[PDB]
RNA sequence: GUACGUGAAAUUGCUGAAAGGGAAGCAUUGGAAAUCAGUCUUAC
RNA sequence: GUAGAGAUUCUGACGUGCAAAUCGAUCUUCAAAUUUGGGUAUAGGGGCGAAAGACUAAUCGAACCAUCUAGUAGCUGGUUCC
RNA sequence: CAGAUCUUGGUGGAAGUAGCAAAUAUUCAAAUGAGAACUUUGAAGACUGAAGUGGGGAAAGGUUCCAUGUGAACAGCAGUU
RNA sequence: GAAGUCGGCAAAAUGGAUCCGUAACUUCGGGAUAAGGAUUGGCUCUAAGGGU
RNA sequence: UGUGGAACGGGGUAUUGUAAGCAGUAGAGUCGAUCUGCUGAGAUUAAGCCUUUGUUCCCAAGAUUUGU
RNA sequence: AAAACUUUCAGCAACGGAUCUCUUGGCUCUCGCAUCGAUGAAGAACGCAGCGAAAUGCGAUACGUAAUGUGAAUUG
């Protein structure tokens, strides 16, 4: 249930052809959909630092790949919310496989 | 909740713009209790309200 | 105020009313026609599905320009929508009717939506400004809604008489 | 029940019934279905 | 050539407009017959006019208001039960 | 009274339709709350770019100023503002 | 490359600065930025042009 | 519950034109445009490219309507 | 070709405010009377109550003072 994993997302393929003025908002939405499909949780909280890194190169230029850390955390106030917390990971090259964090 | 009055007071007391006013986001309840200029000065003294530094406009490239 | 239908006999029913609700009368009518006749529990499941875009409310009378969808096929229609404001009002009234049945001592397992009606409420009116210094109406069409939940749902001639006797009795 | 006497029509929703192959309405005649009165029973 | 003052073209946008005259591009002028605030003067068969019958409160080949006035009608329309 | 582009008021079909497309643009977390695309705070991304979307005044308005409070109604979505 | 069209309408093309060059005509003032040519970055350098 | 699906990674294919870093008995000159080597490198590559003895993950479900 | 939809009819419920009944109002007629102001009128402005915005009333003696009459209220 509660599990933490690193993924690489191909934002280049998911943003191909997207209007320049919606690129970064679309990237955030693709992060949320990416997290929902992987961890099967409808509630997804994006870390403000991850939002900062997505918007790092402006609204029009989003990095071609992002290294994400997805954590299916149980809850804080509710009993069985079972939401995904998504944050950024600083690595030399995001071109690497999915890993399971201890 | 609403801290618009506190921000206008803080800008006036700190002698800067509301763009330069920073409130500790973890002290909203105590900042909201602060409703006068004495209270805002006490917040600034306690460090819960800070005037942020100006944005960077270096003349290094211009001098070079 | 008295309801439209002969039911609302309080021995075996419940009812709930809403007046002057600020939501579109046409959307409310389509929702009411869709939910009319299904069980109260299944009505709740359907309404949450509409709120979540898993099912759609068929638009049968006020369907002008309504787009097509695949979620109308279980009602045998092409035009269907997801009016969330109207469904939210209907959800609140159905919860109120269920509460009334609870206090009245009915059976929640067997309750069905026996009657639901939407009527046009008086229009509140507003102004919109047109070209060439013209002003016209920006009317609002509220709805009165009422719901009732309930349980379950020769002489013969002389010749004819003689013929009948001589044929049946004699044999 | 103050959106307050009575509460019409236009128009509207619900219910029941019915009708419908590019209008509808009407007139005439009968069928079907629903509905109903008179008459009678008595008086001499 | 900028601000500012204008308004040539697209006979573009819009044309139940953002707008009862606007927007975009293009264009004319930009130190003087220049642009303009406030004060003040000129009022309807009058004013004012580098003159278009222009303008004079979205009203101009005679402003607007109220009265005479329910003006007049060989003209159009309507004119109610069996 | 069925007519007069009749009068006044009311209400329809059109129709859940035309439409809500100028002025580059928002996003994440938290708070509040029944309810948050829109309120507030922090973070980020932007714009006006000193002939400003800045700071003031005159004409005009008149209390719109300020704090507190908020069922509606109004802010052509929403609204705790 | 105007064959389009009533018509080059719209669009394109040109465009700053430096140097060279500049016709008819003229009221001698202009025309004129006529027309036509060339040149333009970065970097390392010197050469002059002022004050006590 | 499969030569299953997905998310990535690897390979191929393609586009561009040899990335950043460091090194040089290269560089007009009085630090320095630039050049050379590593370096057909690096970046990008399905978003409607191909392929994968790869890696991790997901799936034996809800609703709804139907009888000769 | 059953449902939907459309139309018709009826019941109920809406929308709307007709109708009926009322009426401290209006209109018309008749009768009677003659009385504004520099001794500040008609009109206007701003105020006045324990809690009032308007209407009504009043003027810093401000929803009134005196005097006369009535006789126990005013009223949210």
XYZ file of C-alpha atoms (C1' of nucleotides) in Angstrom:
740
model
C 0.000 0.000 0.000
C 2.296 2.744 1.274
C 5.159 2.635 -1.233
C 7.675 5.104 -2.670
C 9.039 4.911 -6.215
C 11.077 7.029 -8.620
C 9.781 7.364 -12.176
C 10.921 9.137 -15.313
C 8.136 10.873 -17.233
C 8.412 11.600 -20.954
C 7.008 15.115 -20.867
C 8.419 15.697 -24.362
C 5.930 13.228 -25.846
C 3.018 14.467 -23.706
C 3.663 18.143 -24.545
C 4.363 17.688 -28.275
C 2.241 20.212 -30.143
C 0.760 21.791 -27.006
C 0.124 25.538 -27.178
C 3.074 27.454 -25.735
C 0.882 29.311 -23.242
C -0.491 26.067 -21.738
C 2.717 23.990 -21.785
C 3.533 24.244 -18.074
C -0.093 23.924 -16.855
C -0.431 20.926 -19.182
C 2.761 19.485 -17.688
C 1.281 19.740 -14.184
C -1.907 18.048 -15.400
C 0.173 15.320 -17.051
C 2.017 14.836 -13.751
C -1.305 14.413 -11.937
C -2.649 11.990 -14.546
C 0.679 10.135 -14.538
C 0.505 9.758 -10.753
C -3.158 8.709 -10.816
C -2.565 5.984 -13.406
C 0.477 4.575 -11.590
C -0.622 4.619 -7.934
C -4.399 4.311 -8.555
C -5.128 7.255 -6.252
C -7.404 10.083 -7.382
C -5.988 12.482 -4.766
C -2.572 13.745 -5.904
C -0.606 16.501 -4.161
C 2.218 18.060 -6.190
C 5.166 19.350 -4.183
C 5.642 23.131 -4.562
C 9.310 22.473 -5.332
C 8.225 20.143 -8.142
C 5.910 22.891 -9.391
C 8.891 25.245 -9.168
C 11.047 22.865 -11.222
C 8.348 22.379 -13.876
C 8.038 26.162 -14.248
C 11.824 26.636 -14.031
C 12.317 27.319 -17.761
C 9.172 29.429 -18.164
C 5.655 28.589 -19.255
C 6.736 27.425 -22.730
C 9.857 25.274 -22.188
C 9.344 22.260 -19.923
C 12.174 19.713 -19.499
C 11.897 16.794 -21.903
C 12.098 14.328 -18.999
C 11.508 14.698 -15.264
C 12.646 12.433 -12.430
C 9.692 12.156 -10.044
C 9.353 10.634 -6.580
C 5.841 9.258 -6.038
C 4.735 8.294 -2.521
C 1.340 6.691 -1.865
C 0.860 8.188 1.590
C -2.077 7.034 3.708
C -3.473 10.300 5.122
C -3.062 13.103 7.649
C -6.614 14.022 8.746
C -8.850 11.460 7.030
C -8.801 7.768 7.910
C -8.120 6.127 4.522
C -7.503 8.982 2.084
C -4.578 7.106 0.472
C -3.223 9.937 -1.670
C -0.102 10.255 -3.813
C 2.535 12.841 -2.920
C 4.672 13.753 -5.938
C 8.001 15.580 -5.681
C 11.047 16.235 -7.846
C 14.393 14.434 -7.664
C 17.670 16.087 -8.684
C 19.748 13.617 -10.715
C 22.446 13.989 -13.350
C 20.364 12.358 -16.096
C 16.639 11.491 -15.888
C 17.084 8.808 -18.595
C 16.942 5.922 -16.139
C 14.581 3.170 -15.054
C 11.890 3.054 -12.388
C 13.216 2.297 -8.901
C 11.598 1.484 -5.556
C 12.782 3.689 -2.689
C 13.209 2.075 0.727
C -8.025 34.076 6.606
C -7.987 37.566 5.101
C -4.722 39.455 5.636
C -5.174 42.309 3.161
C -5.501 44.922 5.916
C -2.385 43.541 7.610
C -0.421 43.769 4.354
C -1.371 47.402 3.724
C -0.371 48.269 7.294
C 2.894 46.331 6.976
C 3.818 48.128 3.748
C 3.160 51.516 5.348
C 5.114 50.667 8.506
C 8.066 49.087 6.681
C 8.152 51.996 4.175
C 8.063 49.730 1.125
C 5.603 48.288 -1.356
C 3.160 45.484 -0.656
C 5.176 43.521 -3.226
C 8.124 43.735 -0.802
C 6.091 42.706 2.268
C 6.592 39.136 3.507
C 4.493 37.479 6.215
C 5.468 34.177 7.825
C 2.937 31.782 6.238
C 3.073 29.643 9.406
C 1.873 32.470 11.694
C -1.390 33.452 9.986
C -3.449 33.217 13.185
C -1.202 35.591 15.135
C -0.792 37.970 12.178
C -4.576 38.117 11.784
C -4.844 38.967 15.487
C -2.481 41.884 14.805
C -4.880 44.623 13.698
C -3.150 47.936 14.523
C 0.124 49.624 13.637
C 1.446 48.879 17.127
C 0.642 45.219 16.466
C 2.302 45.295 13.036
C 5.424 46.900 14.514
C 5.522 44.134 17.126
C 5.261 41.550 14.337
C 8.142 43.217 12.484
C 10.162 43.238 15.710
C 9.410 39.539 16.279
C 10.462 38.748 12.701
C 7.017 37.532 11.619
C 6.853 40.364 9.051
C 9.893 41.039 6.865
C 10.668 43.567 4.141
C 12.134 41.519 1.302
C 15.256 42.703 -0.549
C 14.935 44.377 -3.922
C 15.121 42.372 -7.122
C 18.531 42.035 -8.756
C 19.554 44.737 -11.249
C 23.321 44.255 -11.402
C 25.309 46.585 -13.672
C 28.151 44.099 -14.202
C 27.437 43.535 -17.900
C 26.891 47.276 -18.348
C 30.195 48.158 -16.676
C 32.037 45.485 -18.671
C -48.865 23.595 0.735
C -50.432 20.491 -0.810
C -48.678 18.346 -3.399
C -49.729 17.478 -6.944
C -50.422 13.758 -6.580
C -52.945 11.603 -4.742
C -50.085 9.957 -2.752
C -48.328 11.635 0.198
C -50.559 9.681 2.574
C -48.146 9.797 5.529
C -48.755 6.205 6.672
C -46.477 4.624 4.053
C -44.710 7.494 2.220
C -42.424 10.480 2.584
C -42.205 13.753 0.672
C -39.902 16.764 0.348
C -40.363 20.210 -1.214
C -38.114 22.884 -2.680
C -39.216 26.348 -3.791
C -37.591 29.228 -5.680
C -34.396 27.236 -6.232
C -32.035 29.217 -8.466
C -31.267 26.587 -11.079
C -32.449 26.027 -14.620
C -36.001 24.707 -14.880
C -35.273 22.850 -18.129
C -32.286 20.989 -16.668
C -34.285 20.194 -13.524
C -37.133 18.728 -15.587
C -34.758 16.424 -17.470
C -33.197 15.213 -14.210
C -36.627 14.640 -12.651
C -37.892 12.677 -15.658
C -34.765 10.502 -15.573
C -34.899 9.646 -11.854
C -38.690 9.209 -11.728
C -39.474 5.583 -10.904
C -36.138 4.192 -9.715
C -35.395 3.130 -6.154
C -34.058 5.724 -3.733
C -30.721 3.973 -3.180
C -30.135 3.424 -6.908
C -31.225 7.022 -7.492
C -28.383 8.147 -5.228
C -25.887 5.946 -7.094
C -27.039 7.430 -10.400
C -26.772 11.014 -9.130
C -23.195 10.549 -7.899
C -22.358 8.998 -11.274
C -23.767 12.069 -13.036
C -21.701 14.289 -10.732
C -18.655 12.183 -11.684
C -19.500 12.008 -15.431
C -19.999 8.238 -15.265
C -23.659 8.506 -16.318
C -25.592 11.226 -18.116
C -29.081 12.696 -17.833
C -30.983 12.221 -21.123
C -32.377 15.425 -22.624
C -35.709 14.545 -24.238
C -37.867 17.692 -24.325
C -35.347 20.538 -23.969
C -32.756 19.015 -26.284
C -32.198 21.806 -28.819
C -28.510 21.897 -29.695
C -27.523 19.414 -26.976
C -24.491 17.421 -28.051
C -24.345 13.667 -28.495
C -22.714 11.232 -26.087
C -22.173 7.522 -25.532
C -23.633 7.724 -22.007
C -27.159 8.210 -23.380
C -27.366 4.744 -24.924
C -28.692 3.100 -21.752
C -31.690 5.436 -22.133
C -31.924 4.852 -25.891
C -31.120 8.495 -26.674
C -28.298 10.438 -28.303
C -28.538 13.777 -26.457
C -27.581 13.774 -22.776
C -25.776 16.119 -20.394
C -24.491 16.282 -16.803
C -26.265 19.177 -15.062
C -24.437 19.339 -11.738
C -26.312 22.318 -10.276
C -29.670 20.619 -10.856
C -28.380 17.239 -9.662
C -26.998 18.848 -6.498
C -30.429 20.305 -5.716
C -32.127 16.967 -6.420
C -29.563 15.208 -4.224
C -30.333 17.563 -1.329
C -34.089 17.027 -1.686
C -33.703 13.245 -1.931
C -31.595 13.288 1.234
C -34.322 15.380 2.874
C -37.018 12.941 1.726
C -34.954 10.011 3.016
C -34.599 11.798 6.358
C -38.366 12.342 6.467
C -38.913 8.630 5.822
C -36.438 7.822 8.609
C -38.288 9.972 11.145
C -41.617 8.591 9.904
C -40.551 4.959 10.346
C -40.598 3.673 6.758
C -38.347 1.029 5.174
C -35.317 2.352 3.304
C -34.740 -0.905 1.414
C -38.104 -0.754 -0.369
C -38.487 3.007 -0.930
C -38.813 4.205 -4.527
C -39.273 7.643 -6.079
C -43.041 7.492 -6.549
C -43.474 11.093 -7.704
C -41.151 13.936 -8.677
C -42.247 17.139 -10.403
C -40.519 20.362 -11.419
C -42.500 23.569 -11.897
C -41.401 26.985 -13.096
C -40.712 29.473 -10.318
C -41.230 33.223 -10.800
C -38.436 34.784 -12.830
C -36.050 37.112 -10.996
C -34.957 39.147 -14.072
C -31.787 41.124 -14.821
C -30.538 43.473 -17.527
C -28.162 42.968 -20.440
C -26.888 45.794 -22.635
C -26.956 45.407 -26.423
C -25.604 47.289 -29.416
C -27.005 50.679 -30.462
C -27.893 51.623 -26.887
C -30.399 48.790 -26.476
C -31.195 46.932 -23.249
C -33.120 43.684 -22.872
C -33.818 40.882 -20.415
C -31.367 38.540 -18.675
C -34.086 36.537 -16.954
C -33.475 33.680 -14.535
C -35.715 30.595 -14.597
C -35.880 29.054 -11.099
C -37.733 25.862 -10.254
C -40.168 24.524 -7.699
C -39.404 20.853 -7.026
C -41.486 18.352 -5.065
C -40.682 14.670 -4.523
C -42.736 11.857 -2.984
C -41.044 8.586 -2.025
C -43.162 5.557 -1.175
C -43.210 1.761 -0.986
C -44.255 -0.871 -3.550
C -46.842 0.315 -6.114
C -74.458 -10.435 -16.893
C -78.171 -10.921 -17.507
C -79.290 -13.550 -20.023
C -82.434 -13.663 -22.146
C -85.049 -16.412 -21.962
C -83.844 -18.053 -25.177
C -80.199 -17.740 -24.113
C -80.902 -19.248 -20.697
C -82.884 -22.142 -22.155
C -80.137 -22.783 -24.713
C -77.484 -22.765 -21.984
C -79.501 -25.125 -19.775
C -80.354 -27.630 -22.517
C -76.724 -27.748 -23.699
C -74.725 -27.762 -20.454
C -76.984 -29.328 -17.819
C -78.701 -31.888 -20.057
C -75.515 -33.496 -21.406
C -48.450 31.662 5.854
C -47.308 38.042 4.807
C -44.388 35.366 -2.456
C -50.986 36.437 2.220
C -59.410 37.416 0.010
C -61.317 35.335 -4.291
C -57.347 33.386 -8.076
C -59.616 33.367 -14.804
C -56.938 32.917 -19.495
C -52.358 32.788 -22.155
C -48.288 29.639 -20.814
C -45.901 25.540 -17.825
C -44.716 20.585 -15.110
C -46.777 15.993 -13.392
C -50.393 12.005 -13.939
C -54.101 9.197 -16.700
C -56.027 8.341 -21.620
C -55.482 8.835 -26.896
C -53.510 10.050 -31.630
C -49.708 10.364 -35.156
C -45.551 7.746 -42.708
C -44.082 15.842 -45.091
C -48.972 20.193 -40.678
C -53.079 20.655 -37.605
C -57.898 22.239 -36.844
C -63.389 21.463 -39.076
C -68.023 19.453 -41.190
C -71.039 14.932 -42.289
C -72.184 9.675 -41.209
C -71.588 5.526 -38.372
C -68.038 2.046 -35.460
C -65.245 1.350 -31.149
C -64.200 2.720 -26.025
C -65.517 5.644 -21.804
C -69.616 8.341 -19.687
C -74.835 9.578 -18.660
C -79.918 11.036 -18.358
C -84.645 9.985 -19.299
C -88.289 6.236 -19.319
C -90.044 2.192 -16.552
C -91.397 -0.189 -12.352
C -97.284 1.670 -12.043
C -102.007 3.433 -11.958
C -106.757 1.940 -12.370
C 9.292 61.470 -37.089
C 7.437 60.773 -30.987
C 3.700 62.737 -27.580
C -0.546 65.435 -29.028
C -4.114 66.894 -32.813
C -6.406 64.407 -37.293
C -8.953 60.539 -40.112
C -6.619 58.388 -46.451
C -7.079 53.317 -47.451
C -8.225 48.283 -46.405
C -14.476 50.120 -49.262
C -10.472 44.899 -42.899
C -12.798 43.815 -38.011
C -17.636 44.688 -35.884
C -22.407 45.670 -37.777
C -29.284 42.601 -32.204
C -21.063 45.866 -31.733
C -16.891 46.900 -26.509
C -19.192 51.252 -29.112
C -26.643 54.880 -31.389
C -19.696 55.810 -35.005
C -15.712 51.677 -31.741
C -11.109 48.558 -32.809
C -6.736 46.990 -35.915
C -3.376 48.024 -39.640
C -2.193 51.753 -43.037
C -2.038 56.852 -43.422
C -2.186 63.102 -42.637
C 0.083 66.900 -39.246
C 3.558 67.656 -35.481
C 6.409 74.726 -33.198
C 2.301 77.236 -35.621
C -3.726 80.254 -39.550
C -0.722 75.000 -33.603
C -3.193 71.985 -29.598
C -6.054 72.824 -25.255
C -8.337 73.858 -19.640
C -11.233 77.274 -17.123
C -13.755 82.324 -17.276
C -16.790 85.161 -20.599
C -19.897 86.863 -25.017
C -23.343 85.764 -29.262
C -30.203 82.171 -28.858
C -34.162 80.102 -33.102
C -36.407 82.980 -38.974
C -31.713 84.039 -34.387
C -26.657 82.919 -33.486
C -22.122 81.308 -35.549
C -19.905 79.761 -40.194
C -11.318 79.510 -43.763
C -18.846 78.217 -46.641
C -20.422 71.764 -45.861
C -26.957 74.407 -45.571
C -22.055 73.052 -41.799
C -22.946 73.690 -36.519
C -26.067 75.489 -32.378
C -26.653 69.174 -25.770
C -27.118 61.715 -30.240
C -32.540 67.052 -32.350
C -31.077 71.314 -37.860
C -33.036 73.316 -45.471
C -35.224 76.479 -38.928
C -33.082 73.682 -31.866
C -35.738 72.050 -27.607
C -40.141 72.895 -23.937
C -45.296 73.871 -22.972
C -49.680 75.655 -24.791
C -53.407 77.349 -28.779
C -54.945 71.706 -29.954
C -58.991 66.559 -29.294
C -55.414 71.943 -35.263
C -57.516 70.241 -40.178
C -58.664 64.748 -43.223
C -62.377 64.780 -50.786
C -56.807 60.241 -47.670
C -55.498 54.952 -45.064
C -57.066 51.780 -40.867
C -60.668 49.992 -37.367
C -65.817 50.355 -35.901
C -68.353 45.106 -30.564
C -75.245 40.509 -29.793
C -78.912 37.075 -32.507
C -64.926 43.003 -29.723
C -60.705 38.767 -33.012
C -58.717 42.518 -35.772
C -57.527 49.201 -35.657
C -48.245 48.115 -37.218
C -55.326 49.265 -31.262
C -54.043 50.554 -25.429
C -52.036 48.573 -20.780
C -50.289 44.344 -18.393
C -49.031 39.323 -18.668
C -46.937 35.119 -21.257
C -45.054 31.862 -25.276
C -42.303 29.164 -30.024
C -37.320 30.593 -31.440
C -34.101 28.256 -26.856
C -30.952 25.869 -22.907
C -30.175 28.776 -28.833
C -27.004 33.385 -30.346
C -23.647 33.877 -27.133
C -20.222 35.049 -22.298
C -13.249 34.816 -27.871
C -9.638 42.765 -27.570
C -5.981 44.322 -23.494
C 0.527 37.647 -23.566
C -0.900 33.883 -17.983
C -1.078 31.470 -14.974
C 0.625 27.202 -11.621
C 1.646 24.519 -6.722
C 1.038 24.115 -1.370
C -1.392 25.865 2.961
C -5.138 28.522 5.572
C -10.371 29.689 6.018
C -14.920 27.409 4.866
C -20.894 23.448 4.004
C -18.787 24.733 -0.479
C -12.394 27.477 -3.489
C -10.169 28.123 -11.338
C -11.604 33.099 -8.685
C -10.724 34.884 -0.981
C -6.047 35.195 1.896
C -0.680 33.938 2.897
C 3.972 31.641 0.921
C 6.509 29.787 -3.463
C 6.994 30.030 -8.778
C 5.961 32.082 -13.747
C 4.721 36.816 -16.041
C 3.134 41.788 -17.502
C 2.460 47.398 -17.087
C 8.390 49.103 -18.186
C 8.862 56.276 -15.655
C 4.693 59.784 -22.139
C 3.346 53.143 -16.375
C -1.542 49.216 -15.423
C 3.316 53.949 -10.668
C 2.620 58.491 -7.091
C -0.673 63.017 -7.080
C -4.215 66.872 -8.135
C -8.181 70.054 -11.088
C -13.619 69.278 -13.257
C -17.324 65.815 -11.853
C -19.092 62.302 -8.056
C -20.566 62.165 -2.549
C -19.217 58.589 1.698
C -17.711 54.919 -2.950
C -12.918 56.038 2.519
C -12.059 52.750 7.215
C -12.864 48.529 10.564
C -16.454 44.771 11.697
C -20.357 41.714 10.148
C -22.795 38.569 5.469
C -29.233 34.392 4.244
C -30.544 36.612 -0.060
C -30.208 40.446 -4.161
C -26.046 42.904 -7.308
C -20.556 41.784 -9.230
C -24.059 38.639 -17.249
C -19.155 31.875 -14.211
C -18.274 31.515 -9.186
C -17.612 33.817 -4.491
C -15.881 32.340 2.129
C -14.378 38.106 -1.524
C 6.068 37.520 -61.943
C 0.172 41.475 -62.576
C -1.325 36.565 -66.819
C -5.586 38.658 -61.349
C -8.607 43.129 -61.184
C -12.812 48.543 -63.142
C -7.892 49.805 -60.982
C -1.142 46.594 -58.186
C -6.876 46.747 -54.103
C -4.109 43.909 -50.318
C 0.638 42.033 -49.758
C 5.605 42.067 -50.793
C 9.870 44.863 -51.723
C 12.834 49.200 -49.804
C 14.468 51.151 -45.002
C 19.672 53.047 -39.828
C 24.485 55.071 -40.457
C 29.309 56.011 -43.299
C 31.576 56.934 -48.052
C 31.076 57.779 -53.362
C 27.649 59.565 -56.927
C 23.401 62.293 -58.418
C 19.390 64.124 -64.423
C 15.549 66.915 -66.643
C 13.646 71.162 -64.883
C 13.577 75.746 -61.832
C 10.620 81.186 -59.292
C 18.037 79.796 -58.641
C 15.682 79.012 -53.083
C 14.985 73.949 -54.856
C 14.392 69.307 -57.183
C 17.533 65.599 -53.635
C 17.553 60.703 -49.285
C 16.896 62.292 -57.008
C 18.245 58.176 -59.534
C 22.469 54.761 -58.814
C 26.936 52.171 -56.237
C 29.938 50.362 -52.147
C 30.526 49.647 -46.631
C 28.695 47.734 -41.620
C 30.310 41.828 -36.633
C 33.716 40.205 -32.984
C 38.553 40.777 -31.152
C 43.904 42.509 -30.358
C 45.986 46.990 -31.425
C 47.967 51.585 -32.250
C 46.973 57.042 -34.372
C 45.332 61.682 -33.195
C 41.836 65.204 -30.727
C 41.858 68.029 -23.707
C 43.403 69.894 -18.054
C 47.299 70.895 -14.043
C -3.526 -13.641 -16.246
C -1.562 -13.503 -21.168
C 4.370 -15.100 -26.918
C -1.679 -9.490 -21.708
C -1.347 -4.089 -21.045
C 1.204 0.134 -19.342
C 5.266 3.261 -17.634
C 10.335 3.655 -18.461
C 15.157 1.798 -19.966
C 18.275 -0.579 -24.113
C 18.971 -1.239 -29.615
C 17.816 0.337 -34.550
C 16.143 4.377 -37.702
C 16.119 9.495 -38.509
C 17.274 15.192 -37.695
C 21.112 18.537 -36.679
C 26.393 19.419 -37.177
C 30.731 17.801 -33.787
C 28.071 19.523 -27.232
C 29.837 20.820 -22.111
C 34.406 20.113 -19.788
C 39.613 19.938 -19.933
C 44.320 19.951 -22.831
C 47.681 22.317 -26.845
C 55.325 24.446 -28.985
C 47.443 27.108 -32.697
C 46.135 32.584 -32.408
C 46.374 39.078 -34.832
C 48.612 41.232 -30.849
C 49.415 44.307 -26.040
C 44.923 38.957 -21.079
C 43.062 37.703 -26.199
C 37.811 37.064 -31.818
C 39.031 32.325 -33.043
C 41.246 27.419 -34.150
C 42.696 21.975 -32.896
C 42.266 17.224 -30.229
C 39.147 13.998 -27.546
C 34.270 14.635 -31.223
C 30.056 12.201 -37.583
C 30.355 14.075 -31.282
C 26.383 15.639 -28.203
C 21.193 16.713 -28.128
C 16.544 14.887 -30.008
C 13.951 10.535 -31.669
C 6.730 9.011 -31.528
C 4.197 12.703 -29.552
C -0.033 8.837 -35.598
C 8.898 5.472 -36.384
C 10.560 0.170 -35.795
C 12.272 -3.385 -32.197
C 12.780 -5.145 -27.242
C 15.044 -13.249 -23.371
C 15.274 -5.837 -20.095
C 13.307 -3.010 -15.380
C 9.213 -1.686 -12.356
C 3.886 -1.670 -12.125
C -1.134 -3.073 -13.286
C -5.467 -6.607 -14.463
C -9.204 -12.040 -13.080
C -14.585 -5.501 -11.411
C -18.363 -2.278 -11.088
C -22.702 -0.177 -13.362
C -26.684 -0.697 -17.185
C -29.925 -3.033 -20.757
C -31.671 -7.303 -22.912
C -35.669 -14.189 -23.950
C -36.937 -17.478 -29.424
C -43.819 -1.593 -34.460
C -43.289 -0.222 -27.983
C -40.817 4.113 -25.522
C -39.345 8.997 -26.225
C -41.182 13.265 -28.688
C -45.435 16.291 -30.599
C -50.561 17.462 -30.216
C -55.321 17.027 -28.027
C -58.682 16.155 -23.475
C -59.236 15.861 -18.129
C -57.336 16.068 -12.875
C -53.740 18.153 -9.709
C -49.823 21.541 -9.232
C -47.312 26.063 -11.167
C -46.995 30.976 -13.703
C -50.011 35.186 -13.897
C -53.335 38.741 -11.608
C -58.437 38.713 -14.717
C -63.088 38.393 -12.304
C -66.476 39.108 -8.087
C -67.228 41.795 -3.524
C -65.547 45.996 -1.142
C -63.696 51.774 -0.687
C -61.393 57.394 5.092
C -60.638 58.221 -2.787
C -62.149 60.812 -7.160
C -65.789 63.410 -10.107
C -70.121 66.494 -10.648
C -74.076 69.595 -8.356
C -75.958 72.652 -4.596
C -75.625 75.695 -0.078
C -72.909 79.129 2.870
C -68.710 82.262 3.823
C -64.728 86.425 2.452
C -59.814 85.892 5.544
C -52.613 86.745 2.453
C -48.137 90.007 2.769
C -42.602 95.085 4.900
C -46.350 93.926 12.255
C -42.243 89.812 6.609
C -46.731 86.437 2.905
C -46.939 82.313 -0.803
C -42.575 79.426 -1.563
C -37.726 77.357 -0.485
C -33.448 75.407 2.782
C -31.619 73.137 7.100
C -32.963 71.273 11.526
C -36.286 69.364 15.919
C -38.628 62.931 19.223
C -35.715 58.032 24.368
C -35.372 54.727 20.108
C -37.280 58.120 12.818
C -35.863 57.599 6.857
C -40.412 59.414 4.632
C -45.252 61.496 5.323
C -47.592 64.560 9.108
C -46.216 68.478 12.771
C -43.129 72.100 14.689
C -38.681 76.045 14.878
C -32.886 76.137 19.217
C -39.709 77.418 23.825
C -38.284 72.934 17.441
C -43.839 65.774 16.468
C -44.151 71.730 20.456
C -44.994 76.391 25.361
C -49.147 79.352 27.441
C -54.484 79.818 27.980
C -59.524 77.324 27.521
C -62.306 72.648 27.357
C -62.606 67.526 28.294
C -61.327 64.093 32.207
C -57.159 59.323 32.741
C -54.203 58.142 29.000
C -49.965 57.124 25.144
C -48.886 52.410 23.122
C -44.197 49.322 18.688
